[PDB]
């Protein structure tokens, strides 16, 4: 069919100070006890208590679960579901980056569907809406506060599982850039390059629509102008607010268009080595774009212009090549590792990695359909 | 504040055949009896019964209220609320164009907050969310299946009141282009030019954000290419699908950025003389743009390029004027009336029309703030 | 469906001297006696006997029917079927322009399907293929030596009936440019502008395919260069050969894509006043192109370039308008009448002319679907 | 002489689902049982039975001959005539690529003329038309469903003989893109580049006409955009349909313009080593183009533009040179071998390969007339 759908939370708050509304919103939802899912760093920095104060200052109780781990695991989700159940909670508030949103989302799905998070790996495999959730985002690259995606790790298959289900669209989303000033430069760069990967893969995806296209183009332009500014000075408020907008645009686009083999392979490198998601995407992006070039050359040529390149007097092909060169230049200027072996990757895993990548749902929307030898060759090119 | 929010239904279905899902979707909400709000023409066409059959084949009861009138009235809403309660309905399904959507939204809001619809004229004045509502759109220009706007006419004041409330965001939207092939050319032109007005006013609004900008730009570009095609041949499926996308983009843009004095004045001409909304917008747009030019000249110059104009070697001012000339050219090619006098408007009503235009909420986001005399001059110029 | 088809004779001869092969070819078909259908002018010029000698010198008998009239009539077809049967002919050879080709096609169809040519007005209504027919084309504009179209006049309805049937595709075609040198200048101009109309209407028709587009583009480019040369000096052999190629390109294109309201209206003016077909087409072309503009503005802009115009720095709309101006200038340079009233058309018939125009099959493929009032407007415009 | 001719089947069906008509169309022709000529691969995939049912449901009997081999052989034709005479068949339906079309065509010719296939090597070396044949094409190259060319391999001389006879033009053709979705990527690339070779050799051929030029230009332009997309994802329906159009355009063009030394040499390399026809053409295309440059420098400069290259500020020579560079880049991006020795070509057979190529009929239309040394040198340059 030629049918499509657009998903996002019904209410999404933006701008400096929006977090000061969480409690009121939680009260309007008619909830009484919320599990605060955050990470140990943000809890140690004091964010958990500062936000809990706002929540309980509105008549809703909150119990903090600062046990969401970068690249969240099935163990984190099971332990959280116990907290949720033992702690008599009726809502979830996620505070942090994509790991906290996805952990809270998985907890919320299993708290309403019963099984294990692994049971819902795939597309809309769940059979009921998740418990009420307000997602407070503090990184500029996931968009998970708006998506129907939750990435939970199989520690046994060592695979970052993709649960893509409409029932994990958060109830309300909050994007406060004042909460993002504290991102160190490497984190700023990695999340920003994850948003850029989101927008590029959404723009070349087979599930693209004119709506997702509008959003992705804006995201690329804004990231290209403001991400280096956010990496160079995290106290540049303009760059922070524009990167928050760019992150939401890119999340909006990929949620409804689909991603591709950058994310398909990155999920395997992250399930095997706990590498940062955004760094995997940044290392892989130029190679997968070069692989995809012959399928979407006009759109990669447009991406080169969106990325600031001059394409006057150039063929569509040469213009498309300037886009890969600009991506490599951006990654070089933001100090992204050059390959995966310098980070700890091994050949004895490449074939397994490639075989697992061909099973990720994101691969379904990649514009060029590959043979195992191609995924393997891409992974080999990303080793050095 | 630098704070903002983005609102839209959590689930939005697109594409040929999407209406065949209404019953299952309505069932998933756990509702049991829906009032089907439509107009007399579409009910006489058999569409009401087709949709009622799909709904009943999913275990939900249906009571048809086919009495929404073009420019729906407070009387239509009161009668609809009476029907809603007499048949013990727990949900609403709107089928048709903006008049049916707004009648249904108003019925649902009054059924959940009490009072009368006039009580909610303004911005976020109600306290409770409206009863479950699914919106099935059949015109390519309103976007009300996605907006928090319901425009109901005060018959006594002769004023099309604008109720701007987050609580009238539909639960789910359905945009099936197969349901729009039957629009006669005049309706296609008026609805398409209402969507173009939506996108333009959103782009020049004081409430614009990078997100709304993305959506509005795509809407203008698509309307410029496909609206004349849809007017020339309504059986052009590609044009119908692109207009279905453009109408939704423009709705998404104005719902979250705001409108301006085109809509503020159009609501008064429609409350006084019951003209088609899009025809009022098409007549007024060049005049409000010229009035607004000095406030957003860079953005009107960009609009000229989005509309296909060549601006090489021109100042921003001359490029912005070329946009007004292109807007005038599209209206003439779509056989839009030249002015309001030949339609029946009277000079002695101008002063009241302008006064009421300054009380509409859409005027709050107009980039240039007028005084009464300038609103009067605009209406006099629009008499022609 | 997206299904399509390409129709053309299996063998099509081109080049100086090709007619000297007709007799051999007729004999290769296994036929024994052919009815030579031509018009009185070429018969008085001696061409009928010259070709009959070539045919007889190969053992095929010939009976000349020089009774085909410009804008052939139903009476011509009845008289031809009588001769075909009385003279014990088993094949048909048409010699001349479109009038002779269509008369021969009609006789050949009725000789195999019975009934009357009137019964076959419309699309693929016939059950049996027509008797073997070889078409020798002597004008540079109709293309009927290759098409599945036969235009026969219903003398009482005063309507040029369009029989579009695959069973009237000639068996073999001969396009000898040596036979076209004798066309007087007005005939060269009228047939060439009928070919230009074929290519333009094929390019903007809703039934265009990449194949028809390729042929139509080539036709337009060649006509812009060589038609004026062939009108200014009919002894320019290069111009005559290039115009023969262009007529065939335009015929192949319209035969498989469709025409539009130029032909739909021209058939009515020709059935009422027996004006030359190409003159009717040339008078109407600018007005129907202007009416259709909003439906195919990109393709009319491309036509402006094919016609040699410079479109640098122009919007698609201004470029499309330059094409209409180029058509008007060419028609003026070839002494094409400015309007229809000066030739004898009467206002009191416009309504009938319009109503009959909406019943012609060529109207089905026009890119803009009109109303009766708009067809009437096109004619009033073409009257003065 | 200045004479020319255009040949193609009188009825040619295109588009998704056209194959569903084979049976009904076989019903027109009045035939009773057809030998279904295909290859073992499509027979093992089930296509043979699928089509056979469509033929059965129209009252026509079918005998499947799935013994056509890639690079069909004389032996294959004899086995075929044996079965068509045995099952007492009166028609032939070819299902597959160029090998199935050419095998069936040869069977149909010898079944009507009696001799041996080797005897009709050359041009118009036959006396009577072949038996009714409908060709259903499943590859995006060759064009054999429309040509008067049958290439049968003589197992003795190791020579792909080119029989160019009008008596082998199929009765009806079917180009259903739904049957081409299953072509694996290497087959998509090889067939598409065989089509590109057809269009280029037709464009630079000495037998080119304005008609062949129109068709070949369109084919080159479409291939440049859609062949890489069809190789990258064979489930791209738009790319498959556009390539089906392109292969038909290139077939119509080369059939009536001629080919050149790319095909002349490729036929010998394939007769010696059974290499795929399209891979032979792709390896040879740049070297023969460079040999031909001085004869057709303007048309190679035009091909550079048709292929998407920018030629601004360049001499005709440098642009024609950019065209060969674009052909090389296309061959490399679609993984086409760089030379023939890697595939197994022998440096001892170069003298015979070159001598046999100058005896191919395809060399007669090459724009540059060479010496044996030149053909030898081309083959040597294509060895590494
Ligand atoms: N505003 C902030 N200031 C300082 N540090 C922060 C901030 N926000 C997050 N951090 C720190 O950044 C670390 C990484 O947190 P993540 O949530 O894992 O980062 P993110 O890229 O946003 O999420 C990625 C996760 O979502 C999936 O899409 C993806 O596969 C991965 O599982 C954590 O230790 C967290 O404390
Ligand atoms: N697909 C269709 N086919 C044929 N007719 C249709 C179709 N859809 C609607 N119509 C007819 O068009 C007429 C106008 O109906 P509206 O709902 O008023 O059309 P629309 O322009 O979309 O809504 C305008 C209303 O919404 C507000 O934004 C605006 O202020 C106005 O009140 C009605 O009589 C309706 O039957
Ligand atoms: N080569 C020629 N030299 C001199 N005179 C010629 C030549 N060819 C044709 N004529 C003269 O041109 C006159 C008109 O002949 P037509 O066949 O009517 O001209 P043409 O434009 O080719 O066909 C028009 C007919 O075909 C339909 O498409 C169209 O509707 C019309 O009925 C005739 O009197 C004929 O003698
Ligand atoms: N739609 C399809 N799906 C899957 N496989 C296919 C399809 N079509 C063809 N194939 C496979 O392609 C293989 C080669 O078949 P060919 O007919 O030889 O391919 P093609 O390139 O079209 O023909 C080449 C032959 O025609 C001559 O012009 C040329 O000289 C050569 O002999 C076979 O194994 C066949 O099964
Ligand atoms: Mn990501
Ligand atoms: Mn509006
Ligand atoms: Mn004509
Ligand atoms: Mn070939």
Automatic annotation (TrEMBL), chains A, B, C, D:
Q: Tell me the InterPro entries matching this sequence.
A: ADH_Fe/GldA, ADH_Fe_C, ADH_Fe_CS, Alcohol_dehydrogenase_Fe
> Which residue range or ranges hold the Fe-containing alcohol dehydrogenase-like C-terminal domain?
188-383
Single GO molecular-function term? Answer: methanol dehydrogenase (NAD+) activity
Domain named Alcohol dehydrogenase iron-type/glycerol dehydrogenase GldA is located at 9-177
Task: Give a yes or no for keyword Secreted in this entry.
Answer: no
Family matches, as SUPFAM superfamilies: Dehydroquinate synthase-like
PROSITE patterns membership: ADH_IRON_1 (PS00913)
Q: What is its EC number?
A: 1.1.1.244
Q: Which UniProt keywords apply?
A: NAD, Oxidoreductase
Similarity annotation: Belongs to the iron-containing alcohol dehydrogenase family.
Instruction: Name the chain's protein.
Output: NAD-dependent methanol dehydrogenase
